[PDB]
């Protein structure tokens, strides 16, 4: 009675006009969005290809000057002969841009003016005219970048570089991906007696500095040998080098100790055996054996004869530390097998060496001329210029000098660099418009590795691993770890990785947006591949979200009175109104402050997207008609502390206009936990306010009560609003006592007859009387699910 749940259903039903309940086809909706995303990742493929050919056709004619005392190369070094640029503050990138040249970032210890670098600043000065052509062809093209394999990156929209600059392009994920194909590394650390001391500190450092050059689609293991070959970790086969699997290997390498004689035969006979293990789902090429050692005598020729006779495995060898052992046998092993030999004398020589083997793995890529220039999108990572969550498309550029003279007996099998073009996720979340869906529905997409690009539970912060300690990885959330696992969402995931297109309706648990409640619900997972890439755009809809209210309104009078309806001065007699900040052409989003935005909104509709602004007005009037007709009449009902309504479209109203100051739920309706929670049930829901928060409440705010607003407008079910009240506890305390704990799912105390329990309202019932709950759980009431939230912060 107080809220007016059936006092609004009539209002929505009364205005049969001003509606058109249209259906979400859920198959023409995925395909029309999975074809827009494919178009986006294809425009960034033209910008790439057009960039590779221009940096390959200019390299060919450079002439290799060696005298820059005159004809000085001119460029804008990012950390500030040089260019003094003019910077325009562009809100798109969030920093200062110039648009008139390309910045250059020489790493912090590559000499800015050496000969090998001053040439690189010359023949890459012909890219500036195709960097400018690309965006001038299509704006909203964020970062072109040429990652030259001499340290340099020439990223186009020249911003000041973002405390020591350890950035080095040759290690960024978008480079090690373009520059080489998936690997099967196998590090053979040599933990024997002779590496005791400093040589071990460099081996443990350098190993953990090589596991950082491994993507998520290439496997790794870390053996070791001291007259018996074992594993440092507990794995016993190749383990994919995820964000997590690496941490097991890095933390097991760091806890290694030198002891015992050195035996190269028994330690290579263990490496070659773990590369033949073909029932582990390995990445089935670029087998490698990266031996770390100091120096020995035995070149185990009979091992490289039994195994690796036909030269399939590449033995890279590192002779790390300062010593005087024979580096002769080691050099033979890397030369006989198709490898290379690196020397790591001390720290500082670790970073520049462990990234070099990609120049070797990339040899069979250059020779495969244009079957190897294929765009390739990195898994989501955090941009290194404070842009947000981005994905980059990589495309190598080869060195065509002397080509068509058929000289090609040279350094013509190395790559100049990998060049990339960043796509931000906040640009993919704009090709999947969420507002013709219920708050529960959403799109998502996954890699062929399972990691979700574009998921609503993908927070823009680095993924976590392990409990922290007292004292460049990408954001890779697997699809089964962003949502509650069940034996049906495994089938969905396994059928999206294979690229199949289908549909599947089932009843599933859905975690509440505030990680406190779980809701059983019906969900229909539609998915379809994004042709021309390797992704699977899916779309999940509640079974009642198959229709949405698209408003038709052209009278300019009915919306006129709607316009002043939500003016801030009319708030006493029409509730304290909020609007969800949403995407309009030029209207400015909040500064975390809603009331500024509500003021902003009025001018832009006063002056003259179409649907979003058309729908918000219809809700404002439809809500206002309630808050004027019924909510105003029966003012100040006894048990009520506040009466609120929320709609899809933004309008959120509270009558007292004093309780509005105590309205904690954020103005975005599509993120309100209760609005999603109550939309899913077919009854009332009680959301216990948290216990012992930083902010006040739970006495002057009461406890929320909510109910959906179901409508059968033309025989079609809709739930387009949620009305509810904030019940004061004190009024409800007496009616309880006039009749012991009252309780809701999730075990949150609402009231107790005893008034020490009711003092700590909202606490988890089970931090109160745990002996009851553990027994109460075990009577097949109060189930519990235990998921992991890989993106969260801890103090130690």
Partner 1 sequence: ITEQTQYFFDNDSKSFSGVLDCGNCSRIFHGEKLMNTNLIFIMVESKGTRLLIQAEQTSDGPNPCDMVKQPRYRKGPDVCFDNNVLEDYTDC
Partner 2 sequence: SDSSKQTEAECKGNYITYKDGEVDHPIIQPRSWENSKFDFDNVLAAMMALFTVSTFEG
Structure-block tokens of residue 2: 């107080």
Binding flag, residue 404, ligand NAG (CB under 6 A): no
Binding characters for ligand NAG, 525-554, by CB under 6 A (x = yes): ---x--x-----------------------
Minimum distance between the CB of residue 408 and ligand NAG, rounded to whole angstroms? 8
Binding flag, residue 39, ligand NAG (CB under 6 A): yes
Binding flag, residue 15, partner 1 (CB under 8 A): no
Minimum distance between the CB of residue 579 and partner 2, rounded to whole angstroms? 48
Binding flag, residue 221, ligand NAG (CB under 6 A): no
Q: Write the DSSP assignment of 612-646 as a string of letters.
A: HHHHHHHHHHHHHHHHHHHHHHT-S-SSEEEEEEE
Measured at the alpha carbon of residue 534, what is the angle toward residues 530 and 539, in degrees to the nearest 5? 45
- Cα distances (angstroms) measured from residue 360 to each of 170, 186, 776: 14, 16, 63
Binding characters for partner 2, 162-191, by CB under 8 A (x = yes): --x-x-------------------------
Binding flag, residue 428, ligand NAG (CB under 6 A): no
Phi, psi of 748 (to 5 degrees): -105, 120
Minimum distance between the CB of residue 750 and partner 1, rounded to whole angstroms? 8
One of 610, 783, 793, 794 touching ligand NAG (CB under 6 A): 783
Binding characters for ligand NAG, 254-273, by CB under 6 A (x = yes): -x------------------
Pairing between β-strand 502-511 and β-strand 535-542 as defined by DSSP bridges: unpaired
Binding flag, residue 449, partner 1 (CB under 8 A): yes
Pairing between β-strand 290-293 and β-strand 341-344 as defined by DSSP bridges: unpaired
Stretch that binds partner 2, among 93-101, 106-114, 373-381, 431-439 (CB under 8 A): 106-114
The residue nearest ligand NAG at its CB is 71
When computed from its CA atoms, the radius of gyration of the chain, rounded to whole angstroms, is 32
Which residues, 312 to 351, sit near partner 2 by CB under 8 A? 345-349
Structure-block tokens of residue 769: 């009387």
Which residues, 273 to 312, sit near ligand NAG by CB under 6 A? 277, 279
Which residues, 546 to 585, sit near partner 1 by CB under 8 A? none
CA–CA separation, 482 and 462 (whole Å): 14
Structure-block tokens of residue 323: 């010593």
Q: Which does 349 bind (CB under 5 to 8 A by kind): partner 1, partner 2, ligand NAG, none?
A: partner 2
Are 712 and 683 spatial neighbours (Cβ–Cβ below 8 Å)?
A: no
Q: Which does 24 bind (CB under 5 to 8 A by kind): partner 1, ligand NAG, partner 2, none?
A: none
Residue 357: how many other CB atoms lie within 10 Å: 22
**C-beta of 387 vs 703, nearer to partner 1:** 703
SS3 77: strand
Binding flag, residue 122, ligand NAG (CB under 6 A): yes
One of 132, 201, 265, 323 touching partner 2 (CB under 8 A): 201
**Could you tell me which residues come within 8 angstroms of residue 530 by beta carbon, excluding any fewer than 6 positions away?**
34, 35, 37, 38, 41, 445, 536, 537
Are 455 and 78 spatial neighbours (Cβ–Cβ below 8 Å)?
A: no
Cα within 13 Å of Cα(489), Cβ side = 17
Minimum distance between the CB of residue 293 and partner 2, rounded to whole angstroms? 20
**C-beta of 571 vs 684, nearer to partner 1:** 684
Stretch that binds ligand NAG, among 31-39, 197-205, 241-249, 375-383 (CB under 6 A): 31-39
Binding flag, residue 780, ligand NAG (CB under 6 A): no
Binding flag, residue 113, partner 2 (CB under 8 A): yes
Phi, psi of 545 (to 5 degrees): -90, 20
Are 303 and 265 spatial neighbours (Cβ–Cβ below 8 Å)?
A: yes
- Cα distances (angstroms) measured from residue 761 to each of 467, 742, 771: 31, 11, 19
Binding characters for ligand NAG, 58-97, by CB under 6 A (x = yes): xx----xx-----x--------------------------
Stretch that binds partner 2, among 94-102, 107-115, 183-191, 357-365 (CB under 8 A): 107-115
CA–CA separation, 51 and 71 (whole Å): 26
Are 679 and 440 spatial neighbours (Cβ–Cβ below 8 Å)?
A: yes
**Could you tell me which residues come within 8 angstroms of residue 267 by beta carbon, excluding any fewer than 6 positions away?**
188, 190, 223, 224, 225, 229
Structure-block tokens of residue 495: 């059928």
One of 450, 529, 621, 660 touching partner 1 (CB under 8 A): 450
Determine whether the annotation assigns residue 192 to a binding site.
yes
Binding flag, residue 695, partner 1 (CB under 8 A): no
Binding flag, residue 785, ligand NAG (CB under 6 A): yes
Q: Which does 399 bind (CB under 5 to 8 A by kind): ligand NAG, partner 1, partner 2, none?
A: ligand NAG
Q: Which does 528 bind (CB under 5 to 8 A by kind): ligand NAG, partner 2, partner 1, none?
A: ligand NAG
CA–CA separation, 444 and 535 (whole Å): 10
One of 248, 698, 703, 704 touching partner 1 (CB under 8 A): 248
Query: In whole angstroms, what separates CA 755 from the centre of its chain?
Result: 46
Which residues, 454 to 483, sit near partner 1 by CB under 8 A? 464-468, 478, 480
Q: How many residues bind ligand NAG (CB under 6 A)?
A: 34
**Could you tell me which residues come within 8 angstroms of residue 613 by beta carbon, excluding any fewer than 6 positions away?**
584, 605
Which residues, 145 to 164, sit near partner 2 by CB under 8 A? 164
CA–CA separation, 786 and 419 (whole Å): 43
Which residues, 504 to 543, sit near partner 1 by CB under 8 A? 509, 511-512, 515-520, 534
Which residues, 173 to 212, sit near partner 1 by CB under 8 A? 181-182
**C-beta of 286 vs 412, nearer to ligand NAG:** 412
Residue 485: how many other CB atoms lie within 10 Å: 16
Binding flag, residue 786, partner 1 (CB under 8 A): yes
Q: Where are the alpha helices (DSSP H) in 191-306?
A: 198-208, 243-253, 264-274, 303-306
Minimum distance between the CB of residue 184 and partner 1, rounded to whole angstroms? 10
CA–CA separation, 113 and 415 (whole Å): 22
**C-beta of 434 vs 516, nearer to partner 1:** 516
Structure-block tokens of residue 780: 């097949």
Are 294 and 190 spatial neighbours (Cβ–Cβ below 8 Å)?
A: yes
One of 62, 135, 244, 550 touching partner 1 (CB under 8 A): 244
Binding flag, residue 753, partner 2 (CB under 8 A): no
CA–CA separation, 655 and 643 (whole Å): 6
One of 349, 684, 731, 733 touching partner 1 (CB under 8 A): 684
One of 20, 92, 114, 634 touching partner 2 (CB under 8 A): 114
**C-beta of 24 vs 233, nearer to partner 1:** 233
One of 369, 402, 568, 770 touching ligand NAG (CB under 6 A): 402
CA–CA separation, 302 and 265 (whole Å): 8
Binding flag, residue 745, ligand NAG (CB under 6 A): no
Are 428 and 441 spatial neighbours (Cβ–Cβ below 8 Å)?
A: no
Q: Annotate 440-474 with b (16+ C-beta within 10 A) or e (fewer).
A: bbbbbbbbebbbbbbbbebbeeebbbeeeeeeebb
Are 410 and 167 spatial neighbours (Cβ–Cβ below 8 Å)?
A: no
Pairing between β-strand 640-647 and β-strand 741-744 as defined by DSSP bridges: unpaired
Which residues, 279 to 298, sit near partner 2 by CB under 8 A? none
Binding region: 190, 192, 194
What does the binding site for ligand NAG look like in residue numbers (CB under 6 A)?
31, 34-35, 39-40, 43, 58-59, 64-65, 71, 122-123, 125-126, 138, 255, 277, 279, 399, 401-402, 410-412, 416, 484-486, 528, 531, 692, 783, 785
Binding region for a divalent metal cation: 190, 192, 194
What does the binding site for partner 2 look like in residue numbers (CB under 8 A)?
108-115, 164, 166, 198, 201, 205, 345-349
């Amino acid at each position: 009675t107080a809220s007016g749940v059936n006092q609004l259903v009539d209002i929505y039903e009364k205005y049969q006009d001003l509606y058109t309940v249209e259906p979400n086809n859920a198959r023409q909706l995925v395909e029309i969005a999975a074809r827009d995303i494919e178009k986006l990742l294809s425009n960034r493929s033209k910008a790439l290809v057009r960039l590779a050919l221009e940096a390959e056709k200019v390299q060919a004619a450079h002439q290799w000057r060696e005298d820059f005392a005159s004809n000085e190369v001119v460029y804008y070094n990012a950390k500030d002969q040089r260019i003094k640029p003019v910077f325009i503050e562009d809100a798109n990138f969030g920093r200062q841009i110039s648009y008139q040249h390309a910045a250059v970032h020489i790493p912090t210890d590559i000499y800015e003016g050496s000969t090998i670098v001053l040439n690189e600043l010359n023949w890459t000065s012909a890219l500036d005219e195709v960097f400018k052509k690309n965006r001038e062809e299509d704006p909203s093209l964020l970062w072109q970048v040429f990652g030259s394999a001499t340290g340099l990156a020439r990223y186009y929209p020249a911003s000041p570089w973002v405390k020591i600059d350890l950035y080095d392009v040759r290690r960024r994920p978008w480079y090690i991906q373009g520059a080489a194909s998936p690997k099967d590394m196998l590090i053979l650390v040599d933990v024997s007696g002779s590496v005791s001391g400093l040589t071990l500190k460099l081996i443990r450092t350098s190993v953990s500095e090589m596991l950082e050059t491994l993507s998520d689609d290439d496997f790794v293991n870390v053996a070791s040998f001291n007259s018996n070959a074992q594993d440092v970790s507990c794995f016993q086969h190749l383990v994919q080098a995820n964000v997590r699997n690496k941490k097991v290997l890095k933390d097991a390498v760091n806890n290694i100790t030198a002891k015992g004689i050195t035996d190269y035969k028994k330690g290579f006979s263990f490496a070659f055996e773990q590369l033949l293990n073909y029932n582990v789902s390995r990445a089935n090429c670029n087998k490698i054996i990266m031996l770390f050692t100091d120096g020995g005598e035995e070149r185990a020729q009979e091992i490289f004869n039994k195994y690796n006779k036909d030269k399939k495995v590449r033995v890279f060898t590192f002779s790390v530390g300062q010593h005087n052992y024979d580096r002769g046998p080691i050099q033979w092993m890397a030369c006989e097998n198709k490898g290379y030999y690196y020397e790591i004398p001390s720290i500082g020589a670790i970073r520049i060496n462990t990234q070099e083997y990609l120049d070797v793995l990339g040899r069979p890529m250059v020779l495969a001329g244009d079957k190897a220039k294929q765009v390739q999108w990195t898994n989501v990572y955090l941009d290194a210029l404070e842009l947000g969550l981005v994905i980059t498309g990589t495309l190598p550029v080869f060195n065509i000098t002397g080509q068509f003279e058929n000289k090609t007996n040279l350094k013509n099998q190395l790559i100049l660099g990998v060049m990339g073009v960043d796509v931000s996720l906040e640009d993919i979340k704009r090709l999947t418009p969420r507002f013709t869906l219920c708050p529960n529905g959403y799109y998502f997409a996954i890699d062929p590795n399972g990691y979700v690009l574009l998921h609503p539970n993908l927070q823009p912060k680095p993924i976590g691993v392990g409990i922290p300690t007292i004292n460049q990885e990408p954001v890779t959330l697997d699809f089964l770890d962003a949502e509650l696992e069940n034996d049906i969402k495994v089938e969905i995931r396994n059928k999206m990785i294979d690229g199949e297109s289908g549909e599947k309706t089932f009843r599933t648990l859905v975690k509440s947006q505030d990680e406190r409640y779980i809701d059983k619900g019906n969900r229909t997972y539609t998915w379809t591949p994004v042709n021309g890439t390797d992704y699977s755009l899916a779309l999940v809809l509640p079974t009642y979200s198959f229709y949405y209210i698209k408003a038709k309104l052209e009278e300019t009078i009915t919306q006129a009175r709607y316009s002043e309806t939500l003016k801030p001065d009319n708030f006493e007699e029409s509730g304290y109104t909020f609007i969800a900040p949403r995407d309009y052409c030029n209207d400015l989003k909040i500064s975390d402050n809603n009331t500024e935005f509500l003021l902003n909104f009025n001018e832009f509709i006063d002056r003259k997207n179409a649907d979003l602004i058309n729908r918000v007005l219809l809700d404002a009037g439809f809500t206002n008609e309630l808050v004027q007709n019924y909510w105003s009449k029966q003012k100040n009902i006894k048990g009520v502390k506040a009466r609120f309504v929320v709609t899809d479209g933004g309008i959120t109203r509270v009558y007292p206009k004093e309780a509005g100051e105590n309205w904690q739920e954020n103005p975005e309706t599509y993120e309100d936990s209760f609005y999603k929670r109550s939309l899913d049930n077919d009854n009332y829901v009680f959301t216990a306010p948290y216990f012992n928060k930083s902010g006040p409440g739970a006495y002057e705010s009461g406890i929320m009560v909510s109910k959906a607003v179901e409508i059968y407008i033309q025989g079609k079910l809709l739930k387009p609003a949620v009305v509810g009240i904030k019940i004061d506890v004190n009024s409800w305390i007496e009616n309880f006592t006039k009749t012991c704990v009252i309780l809701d799912d999730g075990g949150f105390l609402l009231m107790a007859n005893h008034d020490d329990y009711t003092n700590q309202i909202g606490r988890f019932f089970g931090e109160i009387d745990p002996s009851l709950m553990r027994h109460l759980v075990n009577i097949s009431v109060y189930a519990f699910n235990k998921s992991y939230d890989y993106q969260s912060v801890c103090e130690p």
